[PDB]
Design a protein around this ligand. Structure first.
Ligand SMILES: *[C@@H]1O[C@H](CO)[C@@H](O[C@@H]2O[C@H](CO)[C@@H](O)[C@H](O)[C@H]2NC(C)=O)[C@H](O)[C@H]1NC(C)=O
Ligand code: NAG
Lengths: 56, 176
């Protein structure tokens, strides 16, 4: 995509009442938004080329 | 079939017998007609109903494949996952196809058994009060009106009641 540089991303799950501490003097791609997990349940990632069918 | 009745000594089935799987056709002075054997019919329906349920119940907990993803340097575990999922799907495909062929064999012989046992139920009530014709039919040596026919069909045929009439007729025939 035009670039020889690379960005490498990392993730963690931060439990309630824990804290995350970042320190850096360069090259830091910092969080702005994170994702609060508000509903857990059965799901799956389904591999398909189809798109929505407006049905149930 | 294993029991020798259906497409055996009884040459074919009756399109006219609509209200049972097994039953009777009679002919006497009063007329002729079909009648189901409802007891053997119901027993067989109950058995087949249970069979279908049994087959489905036992397959109720079988293997469910789940998507799992692996990167380009996890090919060994990707392959193990694929073999594992395919392996169970082959086991369960075999179990279903085989169970269906085995039970189908047993269901068709079960019907043959039921027809044979119905024929014998009549044969052993009539004894020598009737002639076995060899084709699934009996020819009575005594007159057998509708109530008498119904006693045969419901297992209450009264052999002693007719034994003298039949003896006289058997002797007339045997004397020529
Ligand atoms: C994240 O914040 C909470 C404060 O809201 C911290 O939990 C408190 O810890 C203090 C001790 O310094 C207690 O007096 C409070 O009772 C605690 N509150 C709760 C809700 O537990 C917590 O320690 C912080 N996490 C970290 C790792 O710093
Ligand atoms: C069987 O048939 C005869 C008809 O002759 C009848 O009298 C009797 O009630 C029947 N019995 C049963 C048990 O259904």
């Amino acid at each position: 995509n035009g670039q020889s540089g690379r960005m490498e991303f990392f993730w963690t799950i931060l439990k309630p009442n824990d804290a995350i501490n970042f320190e850096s003097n360069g090259n830091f791609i910092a969080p702005e938004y994170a994702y609060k997990i508000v509903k857990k349940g059965d799901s799956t990632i389904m591999k398909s080329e189809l798109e929505y069918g407006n049905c149930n | 079939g294993l029991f020798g009745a259906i497409a055996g000594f009884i040459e074919g089935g009756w399109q006219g017998m609509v209200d049972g799987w097994y039953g009777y056709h009679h002919s006497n002075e009063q007329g002729s007609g079909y009648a189901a054997d409802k007891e053997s019919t119901q027993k067989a329906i109950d058995g087949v109903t249970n069979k279908v349920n049994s087959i489905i119940d036992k397959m109720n907990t079988q293997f469910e494949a789940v998507g799992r993803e692996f990167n380009n340097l996890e090919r060994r575990i990707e392959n193990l996952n694929k073999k594992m999922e395919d392996g169970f799907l082959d086991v369960w495909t075999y179990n279903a196809e085989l169970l269906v062929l085995m039970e189908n064999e047993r269901t068709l012989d079960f019907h043959d058994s039921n027809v044979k046992n119905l024929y014998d139920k009549v044969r052993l009530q009539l004894r020598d009060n009737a002639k076995e014709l060899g084709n699934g039919c009996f020819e009575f040596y005594h007159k057998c009106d509708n109530e008498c026919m119904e006693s045969v069909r419901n297992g209450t045929y009264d052999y002693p009641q007719y034994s003298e009439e039949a003896r006289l007729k058997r002797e007339e025939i045997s004397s020529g």
